[PDB]
Design a binder for this molecule. Sequence first.
Ligand SMILES: O=c1ccn([C@@H]2O[C@H](COP(=O)(O)OP(=O)(O)O)[C@@H](O)[C@H]2O)c(=O)[nH]1
Length: 277
Amino acid sequence: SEFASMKRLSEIKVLPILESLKYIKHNHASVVRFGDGEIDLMTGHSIPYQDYNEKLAKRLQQILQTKSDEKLLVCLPDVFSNMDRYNQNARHFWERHFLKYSEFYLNCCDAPFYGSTFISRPYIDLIDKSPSEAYFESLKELWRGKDLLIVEGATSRSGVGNDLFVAASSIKRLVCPSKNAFQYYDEILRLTEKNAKNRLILVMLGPTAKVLVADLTTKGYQAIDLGHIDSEYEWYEMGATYKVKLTNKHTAEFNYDEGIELEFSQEYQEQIVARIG
Ligand SMILES: O=c1ccn([C@@H]2O[C@H](COP(=O)(O)OP(=O)(O)O)[C@@H](O)[C@H]2O)c(=O)[nH]1
């Protein structure tokens, strides 16, 4: 009975977006998020912007086994209870996902609580988009007045052309490959450490981001895996009802990165400390 499995998995306890944010701020915690692509990778599959890699899969598994505490919040998709928050397409996607990974989800995740992987996904799949403004305003309090190090891909351009990070005191960016970043992992970690002094680190880098956040946290940094936050903010700012493609940068779930018409944004260019790849 697949239904039986659905009920059993509702034993997994995720702190919803706003509650996750309170945990993060109260504890100054790093944040690592596991989504469908991470489970795909951990179980042996390649995903649109990251080929399967055995070392990556192993690290992801180790990280998911780490208990959430004062230093790190480990997050899962917030779909195990109150699935009715999400639109029909999203509900179907996620149920098929966690049923397909019954073997995995049944044995992987018996921590007392997890954060929400959807702290980066606060808008587009919701039926009631009313709390979204509150979600983004709470997110923004993470970086208001902070010096940021943003580690992201060449097409991510997080906050470029919008006001998401306007209140950050400064931004430096380590710009990595838009796909298959794990290939360059050692260099990414090395340069992130070098540039992280007195900065809050934000990471938008697919599966590679999870390892980076974990390794940085072990070395004593606060690093926050924010994934596709920019896409959701862009959709939110334009009052989108569906996932419309952005023309000037990467768009979540258009992960082949086709049809992009880049611009030269001087402010963005001046923030770039180095490119990897
Ligand atoms: O090798 C990679 C893998 C992904 N990304 C970027 O990682 C972000 C999405 O990360 P994640 O999959 O964690 O997002 P989520 O959907 O879970 O929020 C996007 O900006 C992608 O462009 C990247 O730059 N290089």
